[PDB]
């Protein structure tokens, strides 16, 4: 049921929307505002699923994902946390690109509740 979610999203407005949805379904959300902070969070705590904005200041979702996969591999007991890409843009082989970038699923913004919750359940 209840999941620990890392949300990386640079836009404050979008952070609040996503948190409202996720908390409505009893999830526990850690919110960060860039890719560097997401990498730092993954080193400190195990999450059930990561929601990762593609375009972010300081460090984007593709770069952060690469670092996360490398770190989680380097562990004595390796782990792999699923990552869902969040993108405003959509529909032209984006999902494959995301999957090539080592992400698991994609969601277009603005986030749709049904899709968000079902994709988390698919992943976690
Ligand atoms: Mg962004």
Author numbering: 1097 to 1220
Article, verbatim:
If the HK incorporates a REC domain (REC-1) is denoted as hybrid histidine kinase (hHK), and the first His-Asp phosphotransfer event occurs in the same polypeptide chain. Then, HPt protein containing a phosphorylatable His shuffles the phosphoryl group from the phosphorylatable Asp in the REC-1 domain to the phosphorylatable Asp in the REC domain of an RR (REC-2) in two more phosphotransfer steps. In fungi, the HPt accepts the phosphoryl group from REC-1 domains of various hHKs upstream of the signaling pathway and forwards it downstream to REC-2 domains present in at least two conserved RRs, Ssk1 and Skn7. Also, we have obtained the crystal structures of Ct_HPt alone and in complex with REChHK6 bound to the phosphomimetic BeF3−, as well as the crystal structures of REChHK3 and RECCa_Sln1.
We obtained the structure of REChHK3, which contained one molecule in the AU, and we superposed it into REChHK6. Both structures demonstrated overall structural similarity (rmsd value of 1.4 Å for 116 residues aligned), although, α3 and loop α3–β4 were longer in REChHK3. In REChHK3 the Mg2+ ion was stabilized in the active center by interactions with the phosphorylatable D1149, residue D1106 in loop β1–α1, the main chain carbonyl oxygen of Q1151 in loop β3–α3 and two water molecules. Also, the conformation of loop β4–α4 seemed highly mobile with scarce electron density, as observed in REChHK6, and the conformation between both REC-1 domains was different affecting to the spatial position of α4. Meanwhile, a closer inspection of the active center for REChHK3 allowed us to observe that the C-terminal of the highly conserved β4, containing the motif LTA comprised by the conserved Thr (T1183), formed a hydrogen bond (distance ~ 3 Å) with the C-terminal of β3. Specifically, this bond involved the main chain carbonyl oxygen (O) of Leu in β4 (L1182) and the main chain nitrogen (N) of the residue after the phosphorylatable D1149 (Asp + 1) in β3 (OLeu-NAsp+1 distance). Superposed REChHK3 in the complex revealed close contacts with Ct_HPt just for two residues located in α1 which had flexible long side chains (R1112 and K1161); thus, recognition of REC-1 domains seems to involve subtle conformational changes. The absence of the Leu-Thr switch was observed in the structures of REChHK3 and RECCal_Sln1 which were found bound just to Mg2+ion, although we added phosphomimetic in our crystallization mixture. Meanwhile, REChHK3 showed a monomeric species and a small amount of oligomer that we could assign to a trimer, detected in the crystal by the PISA server (buried area of 3935.6 Å2 and a ΔGdiss of 38.9 kcal/mol indicating stability), which shifted to monomer in the presence of PAM.
